[PDB]
Amino acid sequence: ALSDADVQKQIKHMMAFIEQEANEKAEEIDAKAEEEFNIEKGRLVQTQRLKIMEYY
Amino acid sequence: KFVNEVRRCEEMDRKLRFVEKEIRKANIPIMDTGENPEVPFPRDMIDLEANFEKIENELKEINTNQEALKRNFLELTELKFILRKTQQFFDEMADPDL
Amino acid sequence: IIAAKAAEVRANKVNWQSYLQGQMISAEDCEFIQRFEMKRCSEEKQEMLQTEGSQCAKTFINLMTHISKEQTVQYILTMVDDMLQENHQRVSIFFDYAKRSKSTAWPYFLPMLNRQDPFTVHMAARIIAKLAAWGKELMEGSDLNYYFNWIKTQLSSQSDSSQYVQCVAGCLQLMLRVNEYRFAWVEADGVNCIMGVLSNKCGFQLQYQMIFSIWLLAFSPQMCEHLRRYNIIPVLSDILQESVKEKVTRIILAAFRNFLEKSTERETRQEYALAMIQCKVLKQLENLEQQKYDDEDISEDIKFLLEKLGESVQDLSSFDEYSSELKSGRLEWSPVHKSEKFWRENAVRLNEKNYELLKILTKLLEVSDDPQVLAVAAHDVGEYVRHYPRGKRVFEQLGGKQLVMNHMHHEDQQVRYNALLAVQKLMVHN
Amino acid sequence: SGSTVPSILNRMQTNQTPPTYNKTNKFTHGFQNIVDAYGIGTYREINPA
Ligand SMILES: CCCCCCCCCCCCCCCCCC(=O)OC[C@H](COP(=O)([O-])OCC[N+](C)(C)C)OC(=O)CCCCCCCCCCCCCCCCC
Numbered sequence: 001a002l003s004d005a006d007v008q009k010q011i012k013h014m015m016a017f018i019e020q021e022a023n024e025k026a027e028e029i030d031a032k033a034e035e036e037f038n039i040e041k042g043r044l045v046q047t048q049r050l051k052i053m054e055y056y
Numbered sequence: 057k058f059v060n061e062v063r064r065c066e067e068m069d070r071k072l073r074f075v076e077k078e079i080r081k082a083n084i085p086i087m088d089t090g091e092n093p094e095v096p097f098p099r100d101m102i103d104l105e106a107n108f109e110k111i112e113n114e115l116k117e118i119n120t121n122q123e124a125l126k127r128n129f130l131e132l133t134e135l136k137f138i139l140r141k142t143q144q145f146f147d148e149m150a151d152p153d154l
Numbered sequence: 155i156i157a158a159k160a161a162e163v164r165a166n167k168v169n170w171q172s173y174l175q176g177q178m179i180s181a182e183d184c185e186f187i188q189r190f191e192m193k194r195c196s197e198e199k200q201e202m203l204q205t206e207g208s209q210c211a212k213t214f215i216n217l218m219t220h221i222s223k224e225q226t227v228q229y230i231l232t233m234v235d236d237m238l239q240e241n242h243q244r245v246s247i248f249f250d251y252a253k254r255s256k257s258t259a260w261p262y263f264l265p266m267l268n269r270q271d272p273f274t275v276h277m278a279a280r281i282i283a284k285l286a287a288w289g290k291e292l293m294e295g296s297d298l299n300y301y302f303n304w305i306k307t308q309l310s311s312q313s314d315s316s317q318y319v320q321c322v323a324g325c326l327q328l329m330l331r332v333n334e335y336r337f338a339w340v341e342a343d344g345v346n347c348i349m350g351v352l353s354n355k356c357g358f359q360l361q362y363q364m365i366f367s368i369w370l371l372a373f374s375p376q377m378c379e380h381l382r383r384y385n386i387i388p389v390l391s392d393i394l395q396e397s398v399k400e401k402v403t404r405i406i407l408a409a410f411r412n413f414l415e416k417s418t419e420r421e422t423r424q425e426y427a428l429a430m431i432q433c434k435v436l437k438q439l440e441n442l443e444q445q446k447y448d449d450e451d452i453s454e455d456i457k458f459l460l461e462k463l464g465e466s467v468q469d470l471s472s473f474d475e476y477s478s479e480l481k482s483g484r485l486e487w488s489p490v491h492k493s494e495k496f497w498r499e500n501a502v503r504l505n506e507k508n509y510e511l512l513k514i515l516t517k518l519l520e521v522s523d524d525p526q527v528l529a530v531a532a533h534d535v536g537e538y539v540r541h542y543p544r545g546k547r548v549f550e551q552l553g554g555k556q557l558v559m560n561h562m563h564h565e566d567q568q569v570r571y572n573a574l575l576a577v578q579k580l581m582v583h584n
Numbered sequence: 585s586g587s588t589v590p591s592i593l594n595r596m597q598t599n600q601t602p603p604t605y606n607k608t609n610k611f612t613h614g615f616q617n618i619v620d621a622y623g624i625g626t627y628r629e630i631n632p633a
């Protein structure tokens with residue numbers, strides 16, 4: 001049926017799909033941010049570890 | 057938005073026109089099956105472009121090489137005839153070797 | 155189907171007083187469950203969780219284990235998932251409950267994964283994965299191995315099966331987001347399982363989840379170096395060419411960027427670049443760049459991949475590569491064999507070592523019986539002749555003309571085409 | 585295409601002028617072109633074909 005109910009259901013499916021796309025983009029960017037944070041933290045902690053090890 | 061795609065499609069059509077024109081120039085005929093396959097929605101355009109680029113570049117290189125080699129063959133056959141007739145002329149009495 | 159199952163479970167509320175009447179559940183657990191169900195507001199739920207952090211998890215575990223009915227298990231799993239989604243930090247309550255119990259929260263649900271309800275099993279797996287990701291407990295040991303094996307079994311199960319696989323893939327991505335779980339999965343046979351899942355040609359969602367998992371695993375340089383045995387790049391490029399989903403394309407491009415940037419050694423980077431070039435990812439990347447997208451991430455990834463591929467192509471086109479390939483008999487249509495700039499600007503070098511390169515080429519053209527090797531040698535000879543006319547006399551003296559003419563009528567059409575091209579190039583000019 | 589989401593069609597009451605479509609046949613194509621030469625008939629008016 002091509003009634004208003006069917007049109008609303010199709011529009012709702014489209015809304016759900018766009019929400020899924022946004023959610024997946026957010027998940028990907030969040031993982032990228034977490035890895036970037038981890039690598040930057042490791043770099044800085046290694047740089048300070050150099051000085052600490054040298055002194056001790 | 058899709059003007060890039062349409063431009064590339066037009067270029068492909070030009071390639072096909074050129075190959076078809078060479079086909080007509082040659083005696084070879086053009087088949088007719090009747091099938092009407094649909095354009096491949098996925099990026100089969102890359103494969104089609106590679107195929108047509110080969111079928112055009114190979115034909116152009118073939119034509120250029122054929123022209124150049126025909127010219128060379130004709131020049132060399134003229135040289136051969138000249139040599140043969142000069143040998144014929146130098147045949148009154150060739151007592152000296154050189 | 156996961157969302158529909160969750161909605162149905164939430165809508166279908168089953169009274170927890172039956173367990174209390176039957177003595178299959180603790181009275182305190184039933185009271186806590188009833189209070190939590192009555193308190194749906196955020197403030198009330200947070201206060202109840204703070205008051206009975208251990209009580210909530212204890213009651214949930216007791217009810218789920220004792221009650222064989224799937225309705226109560228589904229309701230409890232849906233409530234836990236809703237709490238986690240509303241506040242992912244709520245996992246601290248479960249962690250504190252496990253600490254009070256003096257046992258890892260994994261065992262309390264590890265047998266639960268074998269429960270009859272696939273929806274219940276998936277919900278429990280998602281809860282465990284979220285708890286591991288958000289907490290300070292790096293799951294390991296026999297329990298972690300069994301959980302990974304259960305995830306692998308779910309993956310091998312592959313649509314309701316497709317939706318279950320997607321849920322398992324989400325849990326796998328959540329787990330792999332951590333550094334230690336990455337090495338755990340790498341040590342396990344998960345890479346081969348994911349490659350097989352991709353080869354199975356699953357649905358769009360499954361493909362996206364697998365690509366995301368590969369991209370996450372590629373973050374750690376050790377995993378990237380180790381995974382080279384599976385040779386993912388070919389299947390990944392095939393999937394990228396076949397499919398058109400923007401999410402899939404972005405995930406694949408990001409995976410390529412991670413592989414080309416996080417490689418431990420320049421040797422591994424060159425190997426990956428050569429694999430991509432042989433798979434012909436350069437043309438696909440160029441087409442994608444010609445195409446226009448919205449997110450700057452896709453454009454940046456495409457630009458970086460193109461730059462790396464071009465640099466690797468130039469490195470391969472370095473004349474030393476051609477010399478080494480000729481020495482080792484590596485005539486396999488490498489990028490140098492067709493690099494226009496390489497032949498144009500290095501044809502003179504072919505005369506080096508008293509025409510040693512030309513002698514090697516002639517010997518290969520004479521002795522080699524491999525059609526690919528013969529075709530490569532013929533194409534190289536033709537390129538040398540075309541790029542340096544002065545070498546025509548050298549080739550004629552070496553006799554390469556006779557060998558090329560003989561190979562022109564060779565059995566293999568692949569060799570014959572290259573031989574014809576080389577002969578035409580040689581005979582182009584007197 | 586393999587896309588999970590289905591494409592959706594929708595009607596909508598309009599003001600723009602609809603075109604003239606005559607469901608031409610092989611036998612009626614000549615006569616329909618003949619009568620169309622002097623101007624395509626308006627939307628849903630007596631067709632002289
Ligand atoms: C042995 C001889 C026996 C006698 C045979 C000949 C009898 C003499 C009278 C014949 C007149 C032919 C013209 C009418 C046929 C065309 C009408 C039709 O159906 O087509 C629609 C035509 C042509 O078809 P069309 O290409 O428009 O088809 C439609 C295609 N789409 C939808 C894609 C656009 O359409 C029109 O333009 C309509 C106006 C037609 C008006 C006719 C003008 C006169 C034409 C003179 C023809 C040449 C003179 C004769 C020369 C003979 C020597 C070779």
Ligand SMILES: CCCCCCCCCCCCCCCCCCCC(=O)O[C@H](COC(=O)CCCCCCCCCCCCCC)COP(=O)(O)OCCN
Binds near residue numbers: 610
């Ligand atoms: C010599 C003295 C008499 C002169 C006066 C009478 C002249 C009558 C002229 C009409 C007769 C010819 C009709 C065309 C014949 C060819 C058929 C073409 C294809 C066809 O079947 O056409 C259909 C239309 O109906 C038709 O084809 C119509 C067929 C039935 C028409 C009945 C009316 C005939 C005239 C009155 C009765 C006879 C009086 C004289 C005794 C639809 O096309 P399709 O489905 O095949 O298309 C296929 C792709 N779309």
